[PDB]
């Protein structure tokens, strides 16, 4: 329950936050909504010497369309995502997913950026972002760079971010109008990280799938982008043979933990079931 002592900072700008993180070093952590970091500080798994609260940086909050992308500031809360009718018009999968994250209190505080940057495979947004082919905008002392969400995750609490960098925004290509989408999550109760979950976006024409992308949540030490599984759907009617192929190729890449949510073998199968169900719902939406 009780964290170790730390110093607390409120930088006024991205630049000042990056400068602070760079100066203070590895013992400094960004503080966004706090709803993953504070819990692990309370267990003393995390014992940072400094927290750099991003609360006063307005430029980290917001949702805009820029070109062919939606750009979401890292500090945009789950509650804000859900509330954005503009985002629901363009990227309705985000609201659907966010409503499957945590609980109202947590969603008031938790941010998209903190969900994406956290590195716990339990988080839902990572695999959604991989599904959507989002790019993460990172700013550090050496400047800005972009890392694809598909390339961002290496392991539990191991991501591509470098010392002194903040994830400042997530840039999400907007799927075509009329696209199908679904996020299907299996969990033990409200608030629980997925036993398995699947994010799907697809498009159809003339009864055939034209595009499909699939992400899988919490069925490996990272989110997974199920590249082969999505490709096998393309050119099919999204019928049983096609779904069975996609399920196979998705299951093949899983490597789940055996924990209170069940053993790895179950969770692999549940990735497949969630995938099937998500494809079905996406097909119907398409």
């Amino acid at each position: 329950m009780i964290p170790g002592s730390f110093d607390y900072h409120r930088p006024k700008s991205i630049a000042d936050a990056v400068a602070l993180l760079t100066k203070l070093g590895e013992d400094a952590r960004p503080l966004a909504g706090g709803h993953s970091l504070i819990p692990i500080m309370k267990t003393r798994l995390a014992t940072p010497e400094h927290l750099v609260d991003l609360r006063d940086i307005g430029d980290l909050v917001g949702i805009r369309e820029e070109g062919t992308d939606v750009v979401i500031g890292a500090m945009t809360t789950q509650h804000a995502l859900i509330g954005s009718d503009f985002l629901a018009a363009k990227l309705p999968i985000i609201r659907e997913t966010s409503l499957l994250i945590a609980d109202p209190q947590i969603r008031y505080m938790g941010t998209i950026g903190g969900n994406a940057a956290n590195g716990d495979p339990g988080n839902d947004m990572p695999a959604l972002m991989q599904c959507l082919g989002a790019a993460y905008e990172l700013t550090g002392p050496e400047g800005a760079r972009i890392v694809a969400a598909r390339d961002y995750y290496q392991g539990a609490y191991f991501t591509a971010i470098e010392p002194g960098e903040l994830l400042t925004a997530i840039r999400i290509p907007v799927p075509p109008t009329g696209h199908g989408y679904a996020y299907e999550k299996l969990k033990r109760k409200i608030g629980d990280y997925a036993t398995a979950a699947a994010a799907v976006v697809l498009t159809m024409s003339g009864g055939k799938c034209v595009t499909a992308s699939i992400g899988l949540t919490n069925v490996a030490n990272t989110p997974l982008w199920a590249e082969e599984a999505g490709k096998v759907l393309v050119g099919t009617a999204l019928d049983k043979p096609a779904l069975d192929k996609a399920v196979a190729l998705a299951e093949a890449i899983t490597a789940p933990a055996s924990d209170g949510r069940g053993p790895a073998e179950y969770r692999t199968k549940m990735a497949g079931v969630m995938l099937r169900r998500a494809v079905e719902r996406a097909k119907a939406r398409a």
């Binding site: 329950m1 706090g34 109202p104």
Partner: protein
């Protein structure tokens, strides 16, 4: 220690806090507002819920320094200045929405915000809307009734 200034239940508060002090401890220990409760060490139970800048917040998952400049309502702030119970407080009593009372402050504080988010919620909306709040005693059924009763009362005021 950091100096903070905020408002709690409409009153100015100024204090010196260690950054690591959790908001729930600040409220209970330093401010002596012991209505808010601690029911867990993992952020699940919602017994520590307060209304903070228009949000339902689990105050065990926030440091007091993060609440600098905030406006917080705790359960002590729900009754009217003349002592009259809020619609929610009254509904929880009328509908037998509490037993031990331990979740109740958090439940009411969450519900206060719920009914601002959605003044006329369905039962599914209520149950989902309080999903961050655990109760051991009631089995939730009368809590739903309590919230519905409060909505009806609120909706009849204007």
């Amino acid at each position: 220690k950091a100096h903070i200034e905020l408002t709690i239940n409409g009153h100015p508060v100024e204090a010196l806090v260690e950054p690591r002090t959790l908001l729930i401890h600040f409220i209970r220990e330093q401010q002596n507002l012991t209505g808010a409760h601690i029911g867990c060490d993992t952020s699940h139970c919602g017994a520590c819920t307060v209304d903070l800048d228009g949000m339902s917040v689990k105050s065990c998952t926030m440091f007091a320094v993060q609440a600098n400049g905030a406006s917080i309502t705790t359960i002590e702030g729900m009754a009217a200045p003349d002592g009259t119970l809020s619609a929610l407080q009254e509904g929880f009593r009328m509908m037998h929405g509490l037993q031990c009372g331990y979740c109740t402050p958090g439940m009411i504080m969450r519900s206060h915000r719920l009914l601002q988010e959605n003044p006329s919620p369905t039962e599914a909306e209520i149950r989902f809307g309080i999903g961050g709040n655990l109760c051991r005693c009631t089995g939730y059924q009368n809590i739903v009734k309590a919230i519905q009763y409060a909505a009806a009362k609120i909706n009849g005021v204007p």
